[PDB]
């Protein structure tokens, strides 16, 4: 803002004109002073305006390109995360029972609702009350979905271990009742 190309000419002309004015010369030198300084300031005006416009344009361009780079980095990391999640969940497919039921299909297509029903290894049961409990998972082994399951653990709504010896009719009102039963496929 102080070392512009026209600054040298403008300042030198102003200094010379004002020295001539301080010399107390005639009115012609004053008119020449006025004209020269007017045109000098007029030419300095656009040189002082266009540069300021250009700097702000350049700054906006820099900001936009920086934010584009940040967006690309975020895209790369989300892609890596999704790939990791998929390849991690792949490793639990039990690839022998799944293959055994896939090959029985006449064209390779099977409903999705029967894959956990015939290939899962663990079963979870949520029991509202004792009357429902004694009709579904009474004892230590029960049958569901044409298979045999054996109990492995029982917890309550607070996630604390509960032993089957205290799930009775008398002791029922002393438990956080939304019980969760975990079993394993037998044989």
């Amino acid at each position: 803002f102080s070392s512009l190309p026209s600054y040298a000419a403008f300042a030198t002309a102003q200094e010379a004109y004002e020295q001539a004015v301080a010399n107390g010369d005639s009115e012609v030198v004053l008119k020449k002073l006025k004209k020269s300084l007017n045109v000098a300031k007029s030419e300095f005006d656009r040189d002082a305006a266009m540069q300021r416009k250009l700097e702000k344009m350049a700054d906006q361009a820099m900001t936009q390109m920086y934010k584009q780079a940040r967006s690309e980095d975020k895209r790369a990391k989300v892609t890596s995360a999704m790939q990791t999640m998929l390849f991690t969940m792949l490793r639990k497919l039990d690839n022998d029972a799944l293959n055994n039921i896939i090959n029985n299909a006449r064209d390779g297509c099977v409903p999705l609702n029967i894959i956990p029903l015939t290939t899962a290894a663990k079963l979870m049961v949520v029991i509202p009350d004792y009357n429902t409990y004694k009709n579904t998972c009474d004892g230590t082994t029960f049958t569901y979905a044409s298979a045999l399951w054996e109990i492995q653990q029982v917890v309550d709504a607070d996630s604390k271990i509960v032993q089957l010896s205290e799930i009775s009719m008398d002791n029922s009102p002393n438990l956080a009742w939304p019980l969760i039963v975990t079993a394993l496929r037998a044989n």
Binding site: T79, P116, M124, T132
Partner: protein, 207 residues
């Protein structure tokens, strides 16, 4: 209309996505390549490739939103709290979510009381509060879908009611637009199921 009536005979485990096994660089996947609707019958996908190289971004997005892998890599679940069909449990624990009460602005209440409000026998009283809920509330509220029953319609009358409704909806214009003409407000909201582990909608609209 006829499919709605005829679909009530067949077993309920034969409806939904149809999956099969595809290979990506020699590893096997499980993806959905069709659907079996109660109303629309059997629908098969048109662009399915079994053997393929490493997949792109939109294929990752499509395969991460399919319930096939999530259901096939989970445990069996038998839930007796509700009467709706249950598929699988994604973890080893059941989550119980509660609702908290509100916060009391005592200064405003005192200011209102000091001006002759909330007197006995008045016609203005508080009947709007923040109610709290216990652990088993989400499932209890979800269990209200038991009021949805299969309904057959009078087709010869519906085919005329639809014409009258279309006459009602006649002063507008519509069609398809490109991806650069879509207007979205508040891009800082949730994105869905699998996607809420990595960011909001801004991340997926920028990436």
């Amino acid at each position: 209309n006829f499919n709605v009536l005829f679909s009530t005979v067949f077993p309920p485990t034969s409806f939904g996505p149809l999956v099969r096994k595809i290979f990506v660089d020699g590893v096997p996947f499980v993806v959905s390549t069709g659907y079996h609707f109660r109303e629309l019958g059997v629908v098969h996908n048109q662009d399915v490739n079994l053997h393929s190289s490493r997949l792109s971004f939109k294929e990752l997005l499509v395969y991460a939103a399919d319930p096939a892998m999530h259901a096939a890599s989970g445990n069996l679940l038998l839930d007796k709290r509700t009467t709706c069909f249950s598929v699988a449990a994604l973890t080893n624990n059941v989550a119980f979510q509660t609702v908290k009460p509100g916060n009391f602005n005592k200064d405003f209440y005192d200011f209102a009381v000091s001006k002759g409000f909330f007197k006995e026998g008045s016609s203005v009283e508080l009947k709007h509060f923040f109610f709290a809920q216990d652990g088993n509330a989400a499932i209890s509220d979800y269990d209200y879908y038991r009021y949805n029953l299969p309904t057959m319609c009078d087709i010869r009358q519906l085919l005329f009611v639809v014409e009258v409704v279309d006459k009602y909806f006649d002063c507008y214009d519509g069609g398809c637009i490109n991806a650069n003409q879509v207007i979205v407000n508040n891009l800082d909201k949730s994105a869905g199921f699998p996607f809420n582990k990595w960011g909001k909608a801004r991340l997926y609209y920028d990436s």
